[PDB]
Design a protein around this ligand. Structure first.
Ligand SMILES: Cc1sc2ncnc(N(C)C)c2c1C
Length: 435
């Protein structure tokens, strides 16, 4: 695998031991061969599990998620996918790693897609080797891959709202269930319904993942209600997955706004990863996968692939050259390579709107490409009436940094800034000049 100009897809089935058995062997061989190596974890939680798998190997953990005193003599770095793309974008020296290992390489967040594009381009240039670890590489059509033990697969109607009757099978179960929902708001409703029926429920989403995931270890629970983030190597001691088979798809309309379309079917890759949370113990056959819909290739036209091109257009590669998306996922977007390349000061603004502003890539790009500086929030208030953001069926209101109460009405409307109460709270703070 470790020969320059090679990209290997390590596609062993979910739970085959890619992270705990194969990765340490790759890292040992890399160190023997004096390959400057990066290991890319999708989340802080996976980063911490990798430290356990790699314990004693000389690895620099470029994350506060791990408490280790480094030798200063590691030639293997571990960081999150997002950290890699972030450091590429910033005026910070990122080593030209000889070996690029991406764990949970199916992750479809923009920074993960961008990271794959950059890495696969360096490999295509003959500059580096790469290993993408995933059961479900891009364009996989198999929602039912092999498992460590047999899974009972049942197509069944799955609730997406509170219910009073008609789903006894949900609550009659005595084991532990991981339940994939299409949104935080949908999980909040199902979670309240299960809590009312006497169940102990933990909710996971991107924003809450590290804190809340720890509860799955520290307390007894009946249900984990999770968004798609738990597709990314999150492991549970569960005997059932309930899968809505639905997700939200961000869609750019007319180059002008972003809506969260759906819910609509997940990809085969997503369904396989959701299912893949169970059947992982060869000694516990008969874990259950209950699935409420079909799969479809809903990554086609999904805004994350356009956002990945906005990131890659702003990463230095060599002179004016620009990294391509990883070939198998390159047709998910219709983008002119280099169309999103920004001049130095607009690029810095773009980066800061994402890193400090916590804005979605697309919205950060609209603001930066308009020549607005990071701290200039006038655009959060001067949009069309139809861009009015609503809070409890009334226009959301903030006090501007000038001390004026205004309706939140952004010039560019990205549905991700108000997809749930926490998102809207964060965006209100942004519009008020509080970060
Ligand atoms: C961005 C970096 S580089 C780096 N190197 C070593 N340790 C680190 N931890 C302990 C904070 C980091 C972080 C977070």
């Amino acid at each position: 695998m470790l020969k320059k100009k090679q990209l290997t897809v390590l596609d062993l089935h979910p739970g085959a031991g890619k992270t705990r058995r194969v990765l340490p062997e790759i890292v040992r061989e890399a160190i023997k061969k004096r390959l400057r190596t990066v290991i890319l974890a999708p989340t802080r939680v996976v980063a911490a599990e990798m430290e356990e798998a790699l314990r004693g190997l000389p690895v620099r953990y470029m994350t506060t998620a791990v408490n280790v005193t480094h030798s200063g003599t590691e030639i293997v770095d571990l960081m999150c996918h997002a950290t890699f793309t972030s450091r590429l974008l910033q005026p910070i020296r990122v080593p030209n790693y000889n070996l690029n290992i991406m764990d949970e390489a199916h992750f479809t967040d923009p920074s993960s897609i961008a990271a794959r594009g950059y890495i696969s381009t360096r490999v295509e240039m003959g500059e580096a080797a790469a290993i993408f670890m995933t059961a479900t590489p891009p364009g996989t059509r198999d929602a039912f891959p092999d498992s460590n033990s047999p899974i009972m697969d049942t197509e069944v109607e799955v609730p997406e709202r509170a219910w009073s009757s008609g789903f006894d099978w949900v609550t009659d179960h005595s084991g532990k269930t991981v339940w994939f929902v299409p949104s935080v708001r949908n999980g909040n409703e199902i979670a309240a319904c299960l809590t009312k029926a006497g169940k102990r429920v933990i909710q996971l989403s991107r924003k809450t993942f590290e804190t809340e995931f720890q509860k799955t270890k520290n307390q007894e629970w009946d249900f984990v209600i999770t968004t798609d983030i738990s597709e990314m190597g999150a492991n549970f001691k569960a005997d059932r997955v309930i899968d809505s088979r639905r997700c939200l798809k961000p869609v750019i309309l007319d180059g002008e706004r972003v809506i969260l379309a759906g819910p609509m079917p997940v990809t085969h890759a997503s369904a396989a990863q959701r299912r893949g949370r169970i059947g992982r113990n060869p000694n516990k056959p008969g874990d259950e996968y209950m699935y409420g819909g079909g799969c479809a290739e809903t990554d086609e036209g999904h805004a994350h692939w356009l956002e990945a091109r906005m990131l890659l257009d702003n990463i230095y590669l060599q002179d004016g050259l620009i990294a391509s998306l990883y070939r198998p996922e390159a047709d998910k977007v219709a983008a002119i390579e280099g169309e999103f390349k920004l001049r130095t000061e607009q690029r810095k603004t773009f980066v800061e709107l994402m890193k400090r502003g916590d804005l979605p890539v697309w919205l950060a790009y609209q603001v930066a490409s308009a020549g607005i500086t990071y701290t200039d929030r006038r655009w959060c208030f001067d949009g069309t009436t139809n861009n009015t953001i609503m809070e409890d069926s009334v226009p959301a209101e903030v006090w501007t940094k000038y001390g004026e109460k205004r309706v939140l009405k952004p010039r560019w409307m990205d549905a991700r800034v108000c997809s749930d109460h926490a998102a809207l709270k964060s965006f209100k703070e942004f519009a008020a000049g509080k970060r």
